[PDB]
Amino acid sequence: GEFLATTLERIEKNFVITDPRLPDNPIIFASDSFLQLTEYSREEILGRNCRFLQGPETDRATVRKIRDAIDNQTEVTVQLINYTKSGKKFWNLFHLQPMRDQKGDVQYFIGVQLDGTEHVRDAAEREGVMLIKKTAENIDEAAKEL
Ligand SMILES: Cc1cc2nc3c(=O)[nH]c(=O)nc-3n(C[C@H](O)[C@H](O)[C@H](O)COP(=O)(O)O)c2cc1C
């Protein structure tokens, strides 16, 4: 009910945008597709760090890769198990990248999720990474003047 989707959030891809200037680098935008994937309402996740997607089978070494990328303000692509609101597991081929302003300073982080039933390799991995990187570039363009 609360927090009607902006045009940005109706882009037909799973993504979130966080603002590292708020304590705990919380979600400020979340696509309709992301909400369908994860089963949360937008009001339930705005202002929260994305770590709520993690659960018991999530590989914590992989989460550390993401933590390190955020702290060093660089991109990363990983695969990890995430959980919906109701506890359904999915593999997440995940890409993070910072969005920089006109002075090169990081203003937001963009995260793109490609959900699947399995850890992917070879062609499926390559095509997945192609898709989430292109999507991240599209969101970078969309978010530039937010
Ligand atoms: C833009 C953005 C999107 C993120 N999306 C996911 C996600 O899809 N799945 C996930 O497990 N973590 C995601 N994270 C990572 C967590 O929010 C967090 O950075 C990670 O758990 C490491 O920090 P922590 O050790 O304090 O939990 C995302 C982070 C950011 C900045």
**DSSP codes joined into one string, the chain:** --SPPPTGGGSSS-EEEE-TTSTT--EEEE-HHHHHHH---HHHHTTS-GGGG--TTS-HHHHHHHHHHHHTT--EEEEEEEE-TT--EEEEEEEEEEEE-TTS-EEEEEEEEEEESS---HHHHHHHHHHHHHHHHHHHHHHTT-
Minimal-distance CA residue to ligand 1 atom 9:
53
108-124 burial, b if ≥16 CB within 10 A, otherwise e?
Answer: bbbbbbbbeeeebeeee
Which residues' Cβ are closer than 6 Å to ligand 1? 16, 18, 25, 49-51, 53-54, 63, 66-67, 70, 80, 82, 92, 94, 96, 109-111, 113
Cα(116)–Cα(128) distance, integer angstroms: 10
CA 50 to chain centre: 8
Give me the domains of the chain, ranges plus CATH numbers. 1-146 (3.30.450.20)
Ligand 1: atom nearest CA of 49 is 17
Record the resolution, in angstroms. Answer: 1.4
How big is the CA angle at 47 (ends 11 and 84), to the nearest 5 degrees?
A: 65
d(CA 13, CA 19): 19
